[PDB]
Write a protein that binds this ligand. Structure first.
Ligand SMILES: CC(=O)N[C@@H]1[C@@H](O)[C@H](O[C@@H]2O[C@H](CO)[C@H](O)[C@H](O)[C@H]2O)[C@@H](CO)O[C@@H]1O
Length: 141
């Protein structure tokens, strides 16, 4: 699949073929100053945003932390949080999502940040969306 170049945010785009084992999605962007306090990347089914297999949500609030969770039929499950923010505003970053049979491997600038085991079959994911206080340079597959 061709990369989405300079997509505007918010953004929603189809992931051709749907998520598949071995697929690596790269999200290159920059956290802005003066927008909001958080941004997110969502691996979802459809554009509704009601069913999100994997929600990666960095929050520049309360000291800085990232929320990882799944949303099924509009219902958010138990959150997984990490308190060591690997993001810095005004600095471009490479957010890499490696899809494996049992989990998502998430790397920030080549450094493994989190591991999220699939709560729902990843084959159900065909859409990636990004919103919040972030500017995108590109999304590659
Ligand atoms: C401490 C705690 O459980 N707080 C939660 C909030 O995180 C939650 O905010 C939502 O969180 C989901 C991901 O779990 C999405 O990021 C969503 O955009 C947030 O609004 C709220 C609402 O569900 O519930 C508690 O406050």
């Amino acid at each position: 699949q061709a990369p989405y170049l300079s997509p505007a945010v918010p953004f929603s785009g189809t992931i051709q073929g749907g998520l598949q084992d071995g697929l690596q999605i790269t999200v290159n962007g920059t956290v802005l100053s003066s927008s909001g306090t958080r941004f997110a990347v969502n691996f979802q089914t459809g554009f509704s945003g009601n069913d999100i297999a994997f929600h990666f949500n960095p929050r520049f609030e309360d000291g800085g932390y990232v929320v990882c969770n799944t949303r099924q039929n509009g219902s958010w499950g138990p959150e997984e949080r990490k308190t060591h923010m690997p993001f810095q505003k005004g600095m471009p970053f490479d957010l890499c999502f490696l899809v494996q049979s049992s989990d998502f491997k998430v790397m920030v600038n080549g450094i493994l940040f989190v591991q999220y085991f699939h709560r729902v079959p990843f084959h159900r994911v065909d859409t990636i969306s990004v919103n919040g206080s972030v500017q995108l340079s590109y999304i590659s597959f």
